[PDB]
Write a protein that binds this DNA or RNA. Structure first.
Ligand SMILES: Nc1ncnc2c1ncn2[C@@H]1O[C@H](COP(=O)(O)OP(=O)(O)OP(=O)(O)O)[C@@H](O)[C@H]1O
Ligand SMILES: [Ca+2]
Ligand SMILES: [Ca+2]
Ligand SMILES: [Ca+2]
Ligand SMILES: [Ca+2]
Ligand SMILES: [Ca+2]
Length: 901
DNA sequence: GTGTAATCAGTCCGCG
DNA sequence: GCGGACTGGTTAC
């Protein structure tokens, strides 16, 4: 097989590499790698190396990496550019793996672990590690085993061995319900002292040294705790055995405010699952506890135990260990679904970077571009310092707030990457500038044509047309990958809808789900078999279809994010290819494209309707247009349609056969006007929206920019069994909005769009009467809590104290004296409730850690003093008033003459 | 740990 | 009470 790296490090003048050899074996080596860098040289000097602008370079080969680094500094002292890849491990990988890497995930040791630490005096700080580690569960992907290290004897209690038999039993048998599918995969090791536990853990680690190390909060808790605890008991040298090269760095993270300590383990790639989830999931959660995320992702119930975790080991060691094992498994289940580890390996190996560098699109693109250029013997420019400067972005149309009955939307496929490709925007393709007219003049095609030679953006930039830039070249490759995966995702989605339809008529039989590939549209034969299946089999198939869709989603959306990040990186001063001319070329072209096509669509529809000056485009954001279809429907007449699906077909056909060709003609003209390299503006229909046929539903409404709701029947070619709400920006979509309030507001919107004013009024009246019964967590607001200390003046709110910070200070006073009772953590999220006048907490609100029940000793008082009236007005009525006034609807029935009877 | 545009909640305080 | 200046936080692209 072809070799591939596992990890790479620079340690002094040595590259330390773990890799899989041609026989599939893991090996380690130390290489005295001699790096090359580059200097510009005279024209008269024969060379094969050129910088990206075509200027010749001489290669300088250094005796070692430190000599190369020292040369960089002296070049700075002289005032000359030192060219080439200054991150020598990336150069090493480029030399050692000079081919497209094919990796075998089954040979990569992926370790998933979690530790337990009993602490009678608050949260166990990893920097101090003053308490015994009393459990470790470590899952190894190569063995497919859960290794459980269990401390039976501690200063905080001596306990009995954990029983696998009890662990397997149902909760109703007194068991822990450890899933049957992992029972046979547990290797359980009890220890009568912590020293032997840790020594054996380290011997185990040596035997089965993780390549990828993951788990939940492992980077911020488990890794530093384990490292520091071993360090405290045995000394530094023993702790460094966590690194296969015995090198670690105690590395401090610097961001917005304050700092925290992480341990870099050389020769390991740590991908904390919480960080993977935050970067790759495109959710924003009210809480990031594993309980919370597991329930959301997998629909598993919260791990239930009595009393605080600080007393769980002594009171119920059996459950204590079972829950540690289950916690590790839940992360594996989340990954089975989301496939973020797979994604990281794919992207890491593609770029030829340390796998953990997938968190940095700048590092990722730096490596992609370096490897691409190196292939042609080209030499990358040196990174330079630049001042941070603001620059302009997208155009967003101001919508007239209103209901909108029938709506068809369209937007550009991969807008910014397509602009880069079309215009040929790249550091080395800059051809010069032209004299810019106001944007309006380009939009209306009255400005002088910018160039007859070069490809142009309305910001004044010109680009070469003879050859593709490296940025267009490399962005195209990842775009094509994105396109492939999105194809699979949409097929799985369409397949899902077929199953949902079939589920209206399940068969009374006993059978099996069909063995099919959900990434491809079901054949006619498959469709026929599905119509004969039982509900049980159909439901299993739907589950599998949806899992396939999720897998496609992960693969496609994060590839989209990477290519969009390249466009963004052009405007970040740390990017090697930072250039505000290029960043702005993209954004300004985008502004033109949207407004150009708005004009073209209006002109087209006025023509086919025989009107003049009528605005069919009601809204747009960045690269999208929303077109009112009322006049199109009315030209045929609502009475001519058999059912909702009939007019949906009609608009679908109209968009595909009339609008899109008109849109395409409009964009080809714009391409020619800007003299672009290649027409790549592809604005396909997104949504077909409207009320159910014959209903009093309003179909859709906008309250303002980035705030709207649509009742959608078909989304990018997916025809839904049931209409789906596309809601953007409204409170139903915000993690800050209470969960029950999101739900209630969404039902109000559903009723508005699908059923009408009377239905909305009926629901509002019920919610208002019943809502005080809702669980307090479900009606609590959510906020991130930064700078708690800044606003804390002797335990009370300082000037300009934010509402949620005020709540935290209230909480702090209320729990004063406890070494127990959860502390609010700087930077994490809190639930927030308003408090009625004259409450015993002495302020107007209280806040506590999100994803948790508020501590027992104040829970009762919070419940008693919760201000339901303020909560309702602020989170529910105020937003609903905004929705209904925009839609010209009343949420409460107004008086009428009929009341006289 | 790529980017800008945008609405909103809340504080403070003016507005005769 | 609403709005502007401001901070804080979050979402649409
Ligand atoms: N997370 C982001 N970072 C930087 N730029 C972004 C981001 N999201 C959107 N954009 C910019 O807005 C443009 C339009 O966004 P949109 O969500 O329509 O994605 P897209 O790239 O057009 O892909 P799609 O083909 O899914 O529409 C993007 O091309 C770019
Ligand atoms: Ca735990
Ligand atoms: Ca788009
Ligand atoms: Ca599309
Ligand atoms: Ca059937
Ligand atoms: Ca869009």
């Amino acid at each position: 097989m072809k070799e591939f790296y596992l990890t790479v490090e620079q340690i002094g003048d040595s590259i330390f590499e773990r890799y899989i050899d041609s026989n599939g074996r893991e090996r380690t080596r130390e290489v005295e790698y001699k790096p090359s860098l580059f200097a510009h040289c005279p024209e008269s000097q024969a060379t094969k190396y050129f910088d990206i602008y075509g200027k010749p370079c001489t290669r300088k080969l250094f005796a070692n990496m430190r000599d190369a680094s020292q040369w960089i500094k002296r070049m700075e002292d002289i005032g000359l550019e030192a060219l080439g890849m200054d991150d020598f491990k990336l150069a090493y990988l480029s030399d050692t793996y000079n081919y497209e890497i094919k990796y075998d995930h089954t040979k990569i040791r992926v370790a998933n672990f979690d530790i337990e630490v009993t602490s009678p005096d608050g949260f166990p700080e990893p920097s101090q590690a003053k308490h015994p580690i009393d459990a470790i569960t470590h899952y190894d992907s190569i063995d497919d085993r859960f290794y459980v290290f269990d401390l039976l004897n501690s200063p905080y209690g001596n306990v009995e061995e954990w029983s696998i038999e009890i662990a397997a039993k149902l909760q109703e048998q007194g068991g822990d319900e450890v899933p049957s599918e992992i029972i046979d995969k547990i290797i359980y090791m009890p220890f009568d002292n912590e020293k032997e536990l840790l020594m054996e853990y380290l011997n185990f680690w040596q035997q089965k040294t993780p390549v990828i190390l993951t788990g939940w909060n492992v980077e911020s808790f488990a890794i530093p705790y384990v490292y520091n605890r071993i360090k405290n008991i045995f000394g530094e040298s023993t702790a460094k055995r966590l690194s296969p090269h015995r090198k670690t760095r105690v590395k401090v993270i610097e961001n917005m405010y304050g700092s925290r300590e992480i341990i870099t383990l050389f020769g390991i790639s740590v991908l904390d699952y919480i960080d993977l989830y935050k970067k790759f999931s495109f959710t924003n959660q009210p809480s990031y506890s594993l309980d919370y995320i597991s329930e959301f992702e997998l629909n598993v119930g919260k791990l239930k135990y009595d009393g605080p975790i600080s007393k769980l080991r002594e009171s119920n060691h059996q459950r204590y260990i079972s829950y540690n094992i289950i916690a590790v498994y839940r992360v594996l289940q989340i990954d089975a679904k989301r496939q973020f580890i797979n994604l990281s390996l794919d992207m890491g190996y593609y770029a030829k970077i340390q796998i953990q560098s997938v968190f940095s699109p700048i590092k990722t693109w730096d490596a992609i571009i370096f490897n691409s250029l190196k292939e042609q013997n080209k030499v990358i420019p040196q990174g330079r310092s630049h001042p941070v400067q603001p620059y302009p972005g997208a155009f967003v149309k101001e919508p007239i707030p209103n209901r909108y009955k029938y709506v068809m939307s369209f937007d550009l496929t991969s807008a910014y990457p397509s602009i880069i490709r079309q215009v040929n925007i790249s550091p080395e393709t800059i051809a010069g500038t032209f004299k810019v007219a106001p944007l309006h003049d380009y939009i209306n095609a009255v400005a002088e044509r910018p160039s007859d030679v070069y490809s142009c953006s309305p910001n004044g930039m010109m680009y070469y047309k003879d050859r593709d830039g490296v940025v267009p070249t490399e962005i195209t490759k990842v775009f094509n990958q994105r396109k492939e995966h999105k194809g699979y995702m949409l097929a799985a989605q369409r397949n899902g809808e077929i199953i949902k339809e079939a589920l209206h008529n399940p068969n009374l039989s006993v059978d099996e789900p069909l063995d099919v590939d959900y990434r491809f549209d079901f054949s006619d034969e498959i469709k026929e078999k599905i119509k004969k299946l039982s509900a049980k089999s159909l439901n299993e198939m739907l589950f599998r279809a949806q899992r396939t869709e999720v897998a496609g989603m992960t693969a496609q959306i994060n590839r989209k994010a990477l290519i969009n990040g390249l466009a963004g990186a052009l405007g970040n001063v740390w990017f090697r290819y930072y250039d505000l001319r290029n960043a702005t070329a993209i954004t300004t072209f985008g502004q033109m494209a949207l407004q150009w096509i708005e004009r073209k669509v209006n002109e087209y529809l006025n023509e086919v309707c025989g009107t003049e000056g009528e605005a069919f485009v009601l809204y747009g954001d960045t690269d999208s247009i929303y077109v009112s279809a009322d006049k199109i429907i009315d030209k045929v007449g609502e009475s001519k349609f058999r059912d909702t699906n009939h007019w949906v077909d009609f608009l679908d056909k109209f968009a595909r056969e009339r609008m899109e060709p008109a849109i395409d003609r409009g964009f080809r003209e714009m391409c020619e006007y800007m003299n672009n390299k290649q027409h790549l503006m592809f604005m396909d229909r997104e949504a077909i929206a409207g009320p159910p046929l014959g209903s009093k539903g309003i179909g859709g409404f906008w309250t303002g920019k980035k705030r709207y709701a649509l009742n959608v029947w078909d989304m990018e070619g997916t025809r839904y069994a049931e209409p789906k709400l596309k809601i953007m920006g409204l409170e139903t979509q915000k993690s800050s909005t209470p969960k029950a309030v999101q739900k209630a507001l969404k039902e109000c919107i559903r009723r508005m769009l699908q059923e009408g004013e009377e239905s909305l009024q009926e629901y509002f009246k019920e919610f208002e009467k019943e809502f005080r019964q809702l669980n307090y967590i479900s009606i609590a607001s959510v906020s991130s809590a930064n700078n708690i200390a800044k606003y804390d003046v002797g335990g009370f709110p300082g000037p300009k104290c934010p509402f949620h910070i005020r709540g935290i200070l209230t909480y702090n006073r209320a729990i004063k004296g406890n070494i127990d009772a959860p502390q609010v953590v700087e930077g994490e999220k809190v639930y927030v409730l308003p408090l009625r006048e004259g409450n015993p907490f002495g302020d107007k609100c209280i806040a506590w850690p999100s994803g948790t029940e508020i501590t027992d000793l104040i829970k009762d008082d919070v419940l008693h003093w919760m201000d339901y009236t303020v909560l309702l007005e602020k989170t529910f009525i105020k937003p609903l008033e905004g929705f209904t006034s925009a839609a010209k609807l009343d949420y409460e029935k107004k008086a009428s003459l009929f009341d006289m009877f």
